[PDB]
Amino acid sequence: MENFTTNLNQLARVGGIDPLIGREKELERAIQVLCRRRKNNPLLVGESGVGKTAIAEGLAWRIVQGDVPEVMADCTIYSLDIGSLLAGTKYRGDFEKRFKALLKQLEQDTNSILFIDEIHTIIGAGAASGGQVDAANLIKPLLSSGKIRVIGSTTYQEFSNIFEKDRALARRFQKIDITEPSIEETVQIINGLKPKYEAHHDVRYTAKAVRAAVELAVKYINDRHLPDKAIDVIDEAGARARLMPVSKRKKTVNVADIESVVARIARIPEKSVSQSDRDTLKNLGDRLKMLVFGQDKAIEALTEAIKMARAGLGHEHKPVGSFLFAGPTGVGKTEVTVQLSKALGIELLRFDMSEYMERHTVSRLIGAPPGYVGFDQGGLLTDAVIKHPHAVLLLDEIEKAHPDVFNILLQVMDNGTLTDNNGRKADFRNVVLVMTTNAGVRETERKSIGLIHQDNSTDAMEEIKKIFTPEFRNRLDNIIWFDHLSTDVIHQVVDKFIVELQVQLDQKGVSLEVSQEARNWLAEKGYDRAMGARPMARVIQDNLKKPLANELLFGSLVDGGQVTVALDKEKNELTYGF
Amino acid sequence: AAVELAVKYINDRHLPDKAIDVIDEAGARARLMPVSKRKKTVNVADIESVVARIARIPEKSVSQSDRDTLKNLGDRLKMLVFGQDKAIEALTEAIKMARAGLGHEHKPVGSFLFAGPTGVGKTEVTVQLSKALGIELLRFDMSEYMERHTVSRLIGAPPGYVGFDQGGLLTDAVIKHPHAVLLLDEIEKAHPDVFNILLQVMDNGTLTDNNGRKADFRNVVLVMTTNAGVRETERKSIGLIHQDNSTDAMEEIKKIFTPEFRNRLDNIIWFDHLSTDVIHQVVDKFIVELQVQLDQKGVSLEVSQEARNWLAEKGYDRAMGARPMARVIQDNLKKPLANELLFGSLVDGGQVTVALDKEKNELTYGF
Amino acid sequence: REKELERAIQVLCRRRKNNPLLVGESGVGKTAIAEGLAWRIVQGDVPEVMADCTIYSLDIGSLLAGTKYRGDFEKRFKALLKQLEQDTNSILFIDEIHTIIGAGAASGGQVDAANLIKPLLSSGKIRVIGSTTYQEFSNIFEKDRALARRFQKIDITEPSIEETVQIINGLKPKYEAHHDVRYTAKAVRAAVELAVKYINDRHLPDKAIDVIDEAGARARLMPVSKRKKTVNVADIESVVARIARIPEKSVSQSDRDTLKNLGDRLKMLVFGQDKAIEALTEAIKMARAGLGHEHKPVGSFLFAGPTGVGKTEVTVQLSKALGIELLRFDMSEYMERHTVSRLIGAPPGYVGFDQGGLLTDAVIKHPHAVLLLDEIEKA
């Protein structure tokens, strides 16, 4: 007792314990257990960081304050330091000697309570070249006789996995569940605790700041539990605003600072648009339309979803956007998404649904069940989302995956959460789910038989409905049906590819100019409505790169200069030179 | 009473210690009661309260505030889920029979299978029921359980395997919250082999995880939501007259769920589609939620009545239930609102009025 | 890393659980970030709150060395804890935070360095900086809820191109002193860009610097005839090629000749069907001339025609003439849908998982090769 436990009453007398607020029924039942005749040993079990240790030390704090029923008055709770207890037990019997001496001291006191934090650790305290003769059994007979009182604290998992193993020790304690408090209890706890943090960080918290901290930590941080994550938000806000007086920012911590802390912790695009975040969102449709020609309404839908997200009008809990892009090949379905990722400056999560042809490939997405060979790997999808919570999720050619795999995205779109094999949950509320497919293509490109050609516009939707279950479609933000590229779009695509080729050549230090009629001839040569834009890339490659490759590989353009490409009219041929 | 209740509701210790602990805690409680000198005998009510607090289960509460909570539960839910009253009625009656003590022997509070077209309040009624009771909500998306060997994920890996020390998720959750609402979403999309776990649970209210530990489901409401049988109900027959395909819905459900599984259910509540007035109420609900979102930004909003009617007429889709209304309201309101909140008039200001003209059926905006 | 360093400093000055956790992919610079915080403290490039603070890197080996005689490890650990508590101005840096969840005494196996430290961290008594990769974190560290709760998660993200360029600029003098070689700015930028484009198995601030160091080391092995030189873009290209398997600038050698006479060297082996040799040579030339695709295979060709016309022979001869391996797959063996699992592997939890995929592994082992799909109509 001299130097192995710390007097918690002494701490509360010197203010070393943060004050216990609320927890009325919990502490009342802890006292009730303490007042039993036999096995008066309460065990505080609960989630990690919900106030179990807080309750245990707040009992002694209340004793010092005297706001306790007049049966635990003058009782002194001591926190056991197992670490220092085991320090010098090098020789046989030292541990048992010191432990039993402390035990008989506690027996003689008849007023003290021994609080053992993380009591699940005492299932072994030294069997070094020996048997079960450690503290796990030394403490057993004293509890059953009701001579001493011990308070335990452990999480549900550690309890179930370690403490429940020894039924003899397990039955000597009274399990008490410390549940996570609700909103009002948490904000009141913060109200009672924040004087100390204001003192430590030399700041002031507004009431709205505290309420916002509570609500945001609730709806944005799903890693931890309320009474600790809220005060963590508070502490980090205090520290940040305390580091600001380098420019003499002696002021209160308003709501905006709380949102800064929450966004920097949860890695979310918060803190209201502002600065230029507004400029970037403003001309995003432009920066995309200059790289994706035609199919502008897809860019419109994407930008509207992103703005609604940043404007605070997003969904309560859903991905930023859940889009199904369907249309013929080579019309920019994946390109608009990749360019959106590059424009926003965030991560692109590309997944090739063609690799998920079989039903049993779901385990590749979410991980293998426990006990199996691939358990230690987790799942690819959820791991990627957890690593990059703010990103764009691209699922290429979802019609190629097994029709059953869609049921994962079902829950992902509906709730924005996905649980891997470890019970961990990925947060999809900050991702844009975009799925590309060629579903309605073959049905729209059909030939009517009869004297009257029919309207086949609805056939793309018919095919998509036949492929995707009604509940899967019912969770999509919108289905943007892409149309084929028109000839002016083809000219613009040819120009974009010319710019790409020019960049490639500038890398080699040579310049290229292509006459306008040459561009027109290339467009008229390569245009194929049924195949979109890839034939343009192919024809441009064949017509320009191959002659250019020969010219620069074999001397004529080695460290060359200007490439002179123009079109003649008699043969529709191109010119070349240095 | 101490003996009987410690037997029936404590299953972690052995009888000669269970009863002694019940009696000792009752004595300590009656000894702490006389802070106002109420040194009394231990009545049956005190023993019942002690065991209910030990078993973490609800006691007799026909007088407390939760009696009123149960009194107005059906209405406090009907204000959030419009139509489909029979589901709310069944849920409330099951919760009452459990709380009234006139419950099932050792079964869960209620075992209900919710089936019907998508986009209706099958899962939403469950979320709002968990909120209205203030009890934990355990959500399990059975779509993550397509393979038959994912049962190991539910109940844990057998001893002598890599995933043993983690334990099952379902049993661990129920251990953490013995009084909760258990939501199993899209169970027909899980592997049909998984249904046998639910067989065992529904019949006995108990479940043994990998550690031989038994989870107690007697105080957990079991609600499972499916979209099974919907294809037939909405499938058009060929002929001059269409048939009620509800018989086909029943046939499909029986195809998917073995006879004993259907026998271990409290009821199968067939959710209906949403009517037009129900659509109007849904529009009102979503507009209220949008108004809350805007007030978070400091923007008041007023939407006219005929604008509401026009939104409902534009978004009404019988096949998809209430979900299309979300998109309709989204595009028709949030888009101009997002523009005005980002690079427009509604930056730190509100008073946005939306009204419908009759020449173009368009919306008004602005300060 | 001023943003991340500022986040770390903000975390350290907190009242409770003021223990930042540097989480990031390997090679990103987590250990580098901690030791550079120490370095800037030495140079005073810190806010006054962290000034005059001493960071200690905790060694686990020497801490557990010889800790027989139950209590030796505990006594030693508590002695370290007491020295740090008395210092009141020290931060303990644990390079591998996921490795302190076990400290022997498997009998019982509970009183380890993890449970020994939780009271200190929860009380805000001591400041410790951790570091771990993402998978180690999520599979080893975060499993201990109470320990993960006492640490503040900081994501150390992969830097950008220009950030990498500046990092290499700042690190260059040490590599110069080590190799006695000098780097040109164009060479550094080329190293960064080529490492991004062609090296796929590492992350920027550890693979661009890898190219820099290896170029310096090889140019240090050039003065066997005393070829004293600075590192130009050419050496960088050679280095990045030794991993990408195709040099871009070495084409100024006889590689130009091999390209030029390739069509003929094939025509002497494949008679007729000149169109195929022409197409293949044009594709390979466009690739080697830098005009090829930046994210596509060198060439994707479908050869169709009657039997015995040289469809398979021309590809084998092309592989021979180029000196590259022939990754040969017969699509008649993949006549069934489920056979794709041979090419890509089985999902986790299934019998063939640990084997991997045939095609992907063959490609990874041979980054530069010709892929032949015999009888594709049979798959």
Ligand SMILES: Nc1ncnc2c1ncn2[C@@H]1O[C@H](COP(=O)(O)OP(=O)(O)OP(=O)(O)O)[C@@H](O)[C@H]1O
């Ligand atoms: N009633 C309370 N009053 C004030 N703070 C509380 C209360 N309950 C919890 N806390 C906060 O939680 C922290 C203490 O956590 P607690 O001891 O409850 O969990 P724990 O013992 O750390 O759990 P584990 O052993 O799983 O880590 C304190 O920093 C405090 O801010």
Ligand SMILES: Nc1ncnc2c1ncn2[C@@H]1O[C@H](COP(=O)(O)OP(=O)(O)OP(=O)(O)O)[C@@H](O)[C@H]1O
């Ligand atoms: N609107 C467009 N503007 C510019 N380039 C385009 C456009 N549409 C297609 N492309 C070209 O096509 C390539 C990408 O095509 P994309 O991935 O969009 O096809 P897709 O719609 O996915 O068809 P599939 O799924 O069948 O491949 C780009 O390299 C780009 O040059």
Ligand SMILES: Nc1ncnc2c1ncn2[C@@H]1O[C@H](COP(=O)(O)OP(=O)(O)OP(=O)(O)O)[C@@H](O)[C@H]1O
């Ligand atoms: N009765 C209702 N009242 C109000 N809103 C409803 C109702 N039914 C559904 N909704 C809307 O639908 C959303 C919830 O959908 P839910 O999860 O119930 O779909 P579901 O029944 O699972 O369909 P599926 O299983 O086919 O996906 C809520 O956001 C809510 O706005």
Ligand SMILES: Nc1ncnc2c1ncn2[C@@H]1O[C@H](COP(=O)(O)OP(=O)(O)OP(=O)(O)O)[C@@H](O)[C@H]1O
């Ligand atoms: N901020 C930085 N400035 C310069 N170089 C850095 C920086 N961060 C990392 N590096 C480079 O990375 C190397 C050190 O690796 P670092 O400590 O960053 O990660 P690590 O210790 O390898 O991580 P782990 O411990 O997980 O393996 C150094 O050689 C250095 O060149």
Ligand SMILES: Nc1ncnc2c1ncn2[C@@H]1O[C@H](COP(=O)(O)OP(=O)(O)O)[C@@H](O)[C@H]1O
């Ligand atoms: N055009 C050709 N020139 C020279 N040899 C050829 C030609 N076509 C076929 N052969 C010979 O016939 C054999 C079969 O050629 P291959 O291309 O593999 O046939 P397939 O097209 O059926 O795969 C080869 O070994 C090759 O030597």
